[PDB]
A and B are shown apart, each in its own frame.
Chain A
Amino acid sequence: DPYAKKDWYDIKAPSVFEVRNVGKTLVTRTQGTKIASEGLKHRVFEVSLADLQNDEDHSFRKIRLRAEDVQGRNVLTNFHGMDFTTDKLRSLVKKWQSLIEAHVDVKTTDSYTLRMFCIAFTKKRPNQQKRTCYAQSSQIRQIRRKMVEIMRNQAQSCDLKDLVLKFIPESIGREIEKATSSIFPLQNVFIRKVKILKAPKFDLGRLMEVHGDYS
């Protein structure tokens, strides 16, 4: 009975990703004191990057999408952070190696305040004989310092749309690995998580920039 008065809506992803048919979501039909659009606004959808990018190699990454506007039957969402799956992180953390983590708060050109989390692990050499590949605490601090510096530069210059485009190929991770190789070889350098602390007030003009005419 209660489900007989619910209208299904389609979820649309930004133009950054390939597949825009994220899925479907329902909500109670519009009624006095309860507008349907209000109920759907700011709803957070968690969908794997593999579905958005149609690539199974990205199954380890999850994308947070929040609804911004409801144009007709389509719900327009936007990037709202990303994080690893539980299995992915647990697979990277192994004994007999050093774990290095870093975080930084940066502001993009679109007034978006982000908190990027980086992660890396020490890498053995092909001819290495000792079982461990630990790094000295001084080396860890040097590596962590370069992680923060690189993350600031990549985010302080580009906008949110361009910054997200760097996460899909993990361009930032490769740059961090290249820069820190002179200190200690690293493996599995990723941007583990991204948080949206403060977002600029809604602007329909900018929302439609990354969304096409779904009519």
Chain B
Amino acid sequence: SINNRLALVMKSGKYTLGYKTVLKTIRSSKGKLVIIANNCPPLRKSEIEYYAMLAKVGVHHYNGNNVDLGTACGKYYRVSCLSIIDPGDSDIIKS
């Protein structure tokens, strides 16, 4: 899994958690990698992928629902998707 690599970003890199901010980062090209939970709404999932394809940004499908993704990020709220602005330590390379 990518939990170990993701944990490093939460304390050393830059990120935005949530659907509204993820679109903002894709619009400004600040997002380098988009992670989406497996229970994300199908329409929302397609929209994010279309945005990422338009901005030439890689998309990775998280192995879990929004609950697991938030916990892996060291937070107490569900996250359907997130964007990585700064990889921090070898997060975008091996993905």
Question: Does chain A touch chain B in the assembled complex, meaning CB atoms less than 8 Å apart?
Answer: no
Q: Chain B: residues with CB nearer than 8 A to chain A? A: none
